[PDB]
């Protein structure tokens, strides 16, 4: 005769369009990393997905499944290793399928380009290191690791191309970009190398891209900007053009952070985390300010406090930007040139450098 009865099997209370994902590496205890799910409209905690050791994460384009990547060990600190890709239901937040991966999936900080998916959502494109690098391909429908893109050896990160069903690029030690065009079977149909874009030693760029529909902008340690137009058959690279005017140089401003840039495609506005008094070793410093650049005019149009943020993400449809300082998620309105701070979700994570909106 108990009045109440505990029940489970419930779906996320808030609608997808409201959800964002904070990937908590929980570095101090990295074997228990998880993804925290939030309602950006109210900062409410909606749930989570445990990602074991140094897990990475992303949401399926159709916005129905939550793809995660991580490493297990029969005994955690000892025993056979199993690197897998897991497919979780986005609304029930439940495990559904495990996909075997060669024991070399990247193990490091959560940069977006390390765990992405083709534009047509058919394949998941992940990064490998053993330490030799290579890009892995997973057939979502087949639930199997289909291709080991070894031509990407000596390269790093994955920049999907929004204008092609199943193509992506990667930055290489030669300062050029390697394009990989997948065939329907998930294997390398064709490839192409671009001309040098930047100098690996004189002006290294951040792997984090400012992605448009047919072009990607990158910023360098010294405040320069490079580009990769992939509207044509082959990639035409360009740059560099400085983000700094003469006074900005006098104060030594430079870009700093991890997923430190973002692009509001509808306005061509590019966002970057900047910190004055830059020099060797400051490329990962918290953001002292967020700079707003107009890519058409190559000029700064707005600058605001960075609230010690390190990573950001942009939601095109709602014209939003999310900044994260490792533990706090800030919500900005970029419908205007100057960003407008809407709210701060405190303690979204203990140690997170990545945050993403549920697709809409």
**According to CB under 8 A, which one of 38, 53, 222, 226 is a site residue for another protein?**
53
Considering the rule CB under 8 A, would residue 82 count as an interface residue with another protein? no
Annotated ligand binding at 27? The verdict is yes
Classify each residue of 261-279 as buried b or exposed e, where b means 16 or more C-beta atoms within 10 Å of its C-beta.
Answer: bbbbeebebbbbbbbeebe
Annotated ligand binding at 30? The verdict is yes
- In order of 7, 10, 159, the CA distances from 154 in angstroms are 51, 46, 16
The minimum distance between CB 206 and another protein, in angstroms, equals 7
Q: What angle do CA 235, 241, 242 make, to 5 degrees?
A: 145
The minimum distance between CB 276 and another protein, in angstroms, equals 17
x/- map, 109-138, another protein, by CB under 8 A: x-x-----------------xxxxx-----
Write down the residue that tokens 């406090």 correspond to. Answer: 305
Cβ nearer to another protein, comparing 11 with 190: 190
Considering the rule CB under 8 A, would residue 151 count as an interface residue with another protein? yes
Is residue 131 reached through a cis peptide bond, with omega within 30 degrees of 0 on the bond before it?
yes
Cβ nearer to another protein, comparing 191 with 231: 191
Q: Is 82 exposed, middle or buried (0-12, 13-18, 19+ CB in 10 A)?
A: middle
Considering the rule CB under 8 A, would residue 207 count as an interface residue with another protein? yes
- In order of 157, 198, 352, the CA distances from 271 in angstroms are 20, 20, 20
Which residues of this chain interact with another protein, rule CB under 8 A? 27-31, 53-54, 71, 73, 76-79, 81, 104, 106-109, 111, 129-133, 150-151, 153-157, 171-174, 193, 200, 204-207, 258, 280-284
Annotated binding site for substrate: 27, 30, 54
């Amino acid at each position: 005769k108990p009045r109440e009865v505990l029940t489970g099997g419930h779906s996320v209370s808030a609608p997808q369009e409201n959800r964002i994902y904070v990937m908590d590496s929980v570095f101090m205890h990295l074997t228990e990393s998880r993804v925290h799910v939030y309602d950006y409209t109210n900062g409410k905690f909606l749930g989570m997905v445990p990602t074991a050791f140094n897990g990475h994460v992303q949401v399926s384009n159709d916005g129905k499944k939550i793809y995660t990547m991580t490493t297990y060990h029969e005994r955690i600190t000892r025993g056979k290793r199993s690197d897998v890709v897991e497919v979780w239901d986005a609304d029930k937040l439940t495990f559904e399928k495990e996909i075997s991966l060669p024991p070399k999936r990247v193990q490091g900080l959560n940069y977006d380009g390390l765990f992405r998916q083709t534009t047509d959502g058919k394949f998941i494109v992940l990064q490998n290191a053993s330490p030799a690098t290579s890009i892995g391909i997973v057939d979502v429908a087949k639930g199997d690791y289909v291709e080991d893109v070894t031509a990407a050896a000596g390269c790093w990160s994955v920049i999907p191309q929004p204008n092609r069903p199943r193509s992506f690029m990667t930055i290489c030690g030669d300062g050029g970009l390697l394009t990989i065009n997948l065939g329907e079977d998930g294997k390398v149909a064709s490839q192409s190398r671009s001309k040098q874009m930047f100098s690996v030693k004189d002006d290294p760029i951040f792997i984090a891209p400012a992605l448009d529909k047919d072009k990607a902008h990158f910023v360098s340690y010294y405040g320069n900007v490079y580009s990769a137009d992939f509207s044509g058959d082959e990639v035409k690279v360009d740059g560099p053009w400085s983000l700094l005017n003469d006074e900005d140089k006098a104060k030594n401003w430079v870009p700093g952070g991890y997923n430190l840039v973002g692009l509001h495609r509808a306005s061509g506005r590019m966002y970057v985390f900047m910190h004055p008094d830059g020099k060797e070793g400051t490329h990962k410093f918290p953001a002292a300010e967020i700079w707003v650049m107009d890519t058409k005019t190559k000029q700064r149009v707005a600058r605001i406090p960075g609230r010690d943020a390190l990573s950001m993400t942009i939601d095109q449809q709602r014209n939003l930007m999310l900044t994260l300082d490792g533990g706090n998620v800030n919500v900005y309105d970029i419908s205007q040139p100057e960003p407008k701070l809407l709210r701060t979700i405190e303690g979204a994570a203990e140690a997170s450098l990545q945050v993403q909106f549920h697709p809409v």
